[PDB]
Copies of this chain bind each other. A is one copy, B any other.
């Protein structure tokens, strides 16, 4: 059940599609980035068409929508990474088992603001100065404040220790980062290649 806005993949299951500047999709993704990264220079934006990752993510989404008994489980967030990680993420998504602060738990970190992900410690500039940031669909669901050393989100009620929050954050009232602890809770939707 591959999304309408995807382009034909000639019966293949993985493709990176460079977006056309000035069309609705490119402008929408560029605006989300330029909200906080207007001083940067965008070289290109690519749509990640990964059928397998999409399938696994949509299954997790449908499960979270049932468990939480609403939609609103999804947020669009940013993730800066190094050039050498880009092929892995494009193909396999985010892996908590793969450096950098993990103060809110041993998961994959997503930023609310592109400017946070634009830090060199996250979107490490490559031998030619290029920086890489994903726009990510994240199943944040019902979240709570994180803490160091978590390997999963805490339980909602320690009377039912296996009924977990879906994600953790730095701050529940005004979140700036989210951490997820399971594969296929995050779909890398766009890759932005940019410079300082």
Which A residues are closer than 8 A to B by beta carbons? 13, 52, 55-56, 59-60, 63, 66-67, 87-88, 90-92, 95-98, 106, 151-152, 161-162, 164, 181-184
Give the nearest-CB partner of A97 in chain B: B151
- Chain B residues whose CB sits within 8 angstroms of the CB of A161 once the complex forms: 87-88
A162 CA / B86 CA spacing, docked (Å): 10
Q: How far is the CB of A186 from chain B (nearest CB, A)?
A: 12
Are A162 and B56 in contact, CB atoms less than 8 angstroms apart?
no
Are A63 and B55 in contact, CB atoms less than 8 angstroms apart?
yes
Are B52 and A63 in contact, CB atoms less than 8 angstroms apart?
yes
- Chain B residues whose CB sits within 8 angstroms of the CB of A90 once the complex forms: 162
- Among A55, A59, A66, A151, the most chain B Cβ lie within 10 Å of the Cβ of A59
A96 CA / B92 CA spacing, docked (Å): 16
A181 CA / B183 CA spacing, docked (Å): 10
A-B contact pairs, 27 of them (CB 8 A): A13-B66, A13-B67, A52-B63, A55-B59, A55-B63, A56-B56, A56-B59, A56-B60, A56-B63, A56-B184, A59-B59, A87-B161, A87-B162, A88-B162, A91-B162, A92-B152, A95-B152, A96-B97, A97-B106, A97-B151, A97-B152, A97-B181, A98-B151, A182-B183, A183-B183, A183-B184, A184-B184
Q: How far is the CB of A87 from chain B (nearest CB, A)?
A: 5
A183 CA / B182 CA spacing, docked (Å): 7
Give the nearest-CB partner of A87 in chain B: B162
A98 CA / B162 CA spacing, docked (Å): 13
- Chain B residues whose CB sits within 8 angstroms of the CB of A181 once the complex forms: 97
A90 CA / B161 CA spacing, docked (Å): 12
- Chain B residues whose CB sits within 8 angstroms of the CB of A67 once the complex forms: 13, 52
Known pairs A87-B161, A182-B183 / 10 extra A-B pairs, C-beta < 8 Å: A13-B66, A52-B63, A56-B59, A56-B184, A59-B59, A88-B162, A97-B151, A97-B181, A98-B152, A184-B184
